[PDB]
From a paper:
The Arabidopsis VEL proteins are accessory proteins that interact with PRC2 to nucleate and propagate silencing at the FLOWERING LOCUS C (FLC) locus, enabling early flowering in spring. Here, we report that VEL proteins contain a domain related to an atypical four-helix bundle that engages in spontaneous concentration-dependent head-to-tail polymerization to assemble dynamic biomolecular condensates. The VEL domain adopts a compact globular fold, consisting of four α-helices in a quasi-antiparallel “up-down-up-down” configuration, each of which contributes to the hydrophobic core, as illustrated by VEL1VEL. Mutations blocking polymerization of this VEL domain prevent Polycomb silencing at FLC.
To test the function of VEL polymerization in FLC silencing in plants, we generated WT and mutant VIN3-GFP transgenes bearing R556D and I575D (RI>DD) for stable transformation of the Arabidopsis null mutant vin3-1 FRI. We confirmed by SEC-MALS that the polymerization of this double mutant is completely disabled. VIN3VEL crystals also show protofilaments; however, these are invariably composed of dimers rather than monomers as in VEL1VEL. Indeed, dimers are seen in every single crystal, regardless of the mutant, space groups, or crystallization conditions. Interestingly, these dimers result from mutual domain swapping of H4 between individual VIN3VEL monomers whereby molecule A donates its H4 to molecule B in an adjacent VIN3VEL filament, and vice versa. In contrast, the RI>DD transgene did not complement the FLC silencing defect of vin3-1 FRI, resulting in derepression of FLC, with high FLC transcript levels comparable to those seen in the null vin3-1 FRI mutant; importantly, the defective FLC silencing in the RI>DD rescue lines occurred both during and after cold exposure (orange).
Numbering used by the authors:
A (entry chain B): 533 to 600
B (entry chain A): 531 to 603
The structure:
Amino acid sequence: LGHIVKTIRCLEEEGHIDKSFREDFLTWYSLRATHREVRVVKDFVETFMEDLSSLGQQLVDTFSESIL
Amino acid sequence: KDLGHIVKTIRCLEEEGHIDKSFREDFLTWYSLRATHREVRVVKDFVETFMEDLSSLGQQLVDTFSESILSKK
Ligand SMILES: [Mg+2]
């Protein structure tokens, strides 16, 4: 749930969604999203968090290689 | 403009626990003083991909939410 909120705040701060959407989405997610819809959201966010992790590794690897 | 994207990306990595403060600081030093033009290009491409993925995620979440509304009918 923390990942969902973080992601949504990031999207808002970058201008991809507005405040109304942040509120509506998070309310829906917590209280009205079905088990299937939650699974859909979680998979999208999970993929994103995995790609972010991978990016971290790539940056760390690039830095390290440059040093030796 | 790409510079702000790099800083955003780095903050994201830090806030998610992928890097620590020492790495962030060293990375900035490395980027400014030691990174080759190729290495800088590699960093910029990684960050661009991340900003595009973030945009895409937004669309996916908005579309999922929209679909959920329609399915109430
Ligand atoms: Mg986390």
